[PDB]
């Protein structure tokens, strides 16, 4: 009698090329090729990190040794005369 199958869902999703049905709490599939890299977004995170580092500096009770403070790319810089430098990540 039947086959009544209507399903707009993937109908959309394929209409948009494709769909969610792979791995929602079954992520492994995409997972099992280990996740990739990214270069486009290699900059918004860095800048936002620099800004929150500036904010921590505002919220610090800094010791006198902080002089020659230069901000850089994913590398907190604190250079002293005796010349040990730590770029930690308040």
């Amino acid at each position: 009698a039947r086959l009544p199958s209507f399903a707009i869902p993937y109908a959309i999703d394929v209409l948009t090329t494709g769909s969610y049905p792979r791995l929602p709490t079954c992520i492994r599939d995409k997972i099992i090729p280990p996740d990739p890299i990214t270069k486009i977004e290699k900059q918004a995170t860095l800048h936002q990190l620099n800004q929150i580092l500036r904010h921590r500096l505002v919220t610090t009770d800094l010791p006198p040794q902080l002089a020659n403070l230069t901000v850089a790319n994913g590398r907190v810089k604190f250079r002293v005369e005796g010349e040990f430098e730590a770029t930690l990540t308040v």
């Binding site: 086959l3 199958s5 209507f6 707009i8 209409l15």
Partner: protein
Amino acid sequence: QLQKQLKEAEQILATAVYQAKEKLKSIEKARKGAISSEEIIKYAHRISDLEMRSGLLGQMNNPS
């Protein structure tokens, strides 16, 4: 106090921006053919090994 206010206002509106980009990639393409689907309807409908070897093609591959 300002700042934390911002913080919120931001990652809130950030929430936006995500849903937004949905809005864009869509909004170009939004409602293709605007019927344009009905096929997909029946399509999936009649969409829904030897089977594949009922391979109209492989069926051409019977030797070849």
